[PDB]
Design a protein around this ligand. Sequence first.
Ligand SMILES: O=C(O)C1=C(C(=O)Nc2sc3c(c2-c2nc(C4CC4)no2)CCC(F)(F)C3)COCC1
Ligand SMILES: [Cl-]
Length: 134
Amino acid sequence: SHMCDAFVGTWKLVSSENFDDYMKEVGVGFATRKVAGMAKPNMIISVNGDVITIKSESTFKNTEISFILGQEFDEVTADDRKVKSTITLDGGVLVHVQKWDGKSTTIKRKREDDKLVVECVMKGVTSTRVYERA
Ligand SMILES: O=C(O)C1=C(C(=O)Nc2sc3c(c2-c2nc(C4CC4)no2)CCC(F)(F)C3)COCC1
Ligand SMILES: [Cl-]
């Protein structure tokens, strides 16, 4: 066992707040914002040795990353940005930083009660997305 075990499983989106404005701040265009905002993704998190895999599955995109904590990787995001990403575990929170074109956004994933809470921030704009077990 590892501490990341509290994240493993299949999670379904149950609430979203401020996501459209977060996407505006990131630079997502209108049509992608509208279709992304309508999505009700599942998030599937698994661990195999040191490798963590996070899959986002929805109508109009399935996206998957695999990574080792603390080891930078190239990522193509659901909105088609090419970013450099690093994910670490800090005090029980998975912290995902994405860097591209002199910009940065941080995505935190935390277990709170029976929820997986995703907090997304860029400059001062935050969105909170709440998942429950599927
Ligand atoms: O995992 C999340 O809840 C989180 C995100 C998420 O779900 N984004 C989703 S799902 C999903 C889409 C996107 C999406 N994002 C973005 C920009 C904001 C990154 N552009 O498109 C597009 C296609 C789809 F509609 F078919 C399905 C995004 O960032 C934070 C955590
Ligand atoms: Cl770490």
